[PDB]
């Protein structure tokens, strides 16, 4: 039938909330002070980067921190990570949910470990998308949503 879809902008932007952490404190993590160090830029524009839904912070004891795995080895977002963030922002899912699939090493998942050579069945898909095997939590992002 002809019936274009009034859906050509996606709403990749909103407000992103922050709560439960689901990275263990044991996990390496950035901070407000720390991502402004690491980007050279102000807490503020750290906080616009939030807003606009390329990056996801979690609360811990009251102190707000971001993954460090949200960011690759270059210290540069994930490029497909504000992409996963637009269609979970689209389905609803808050930031704890977020990091809840992607934080959870999945069995049916095999990929090689992020600097590594070698293979790991059951990993995080967090390692995946570090390692541009991205598309794998794409697909999972998908899944949870639509």
Same mark, same amino acid.
């Given at each position: 039938?002809?019936?274009?879809?009034?859906?050509?902008?996606?709403? %990749?932007?909103?407000?992103?909330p922050a709560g439960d952490d689901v990275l263990d404190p044991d996990e390496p993590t950035y901070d407000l002070p720390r991502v402004a160090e690491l980007l050279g830029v102000p807490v503020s524009k750290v906080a616009q980067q939030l807003r606009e839904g390329h990056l996801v912070a979690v609360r811990r004891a009251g102190g707000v921190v971001i993954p460090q795995v949200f960011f690759t080895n270059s210290g540069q977002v994930v490029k497909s990570l504000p992409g996963l963030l637009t269609i979970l922002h689209d389905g609803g899912y808050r930031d704890t949910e977020?990091? %809840?699939?992607?934080?959870?090493?999945?069995?049916?998942?095999?990929?090689?470990?992020?600097?590594? %050579?070698?293979?790991?069945?059951?990993?995080?898909?967090?390692?995946?998308?570090?390692?541009?095997?991205?598309r794998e939590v794409v697909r999972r992002a998908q899944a949870m949503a639509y």
């Open positions: 039938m002809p019936g274009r879809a009034p859906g050509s902008t996606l709403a %990749r932007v909103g407000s992103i977020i990091m %809840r699939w992607l934080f959870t090493p999945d069995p049916s998942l095999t990929i090689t470990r992020d600097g590594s %050579r070698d293979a790991v069945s059951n990993a995080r898909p967090v390692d995946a998308l570090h390692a541009h095997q991205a």
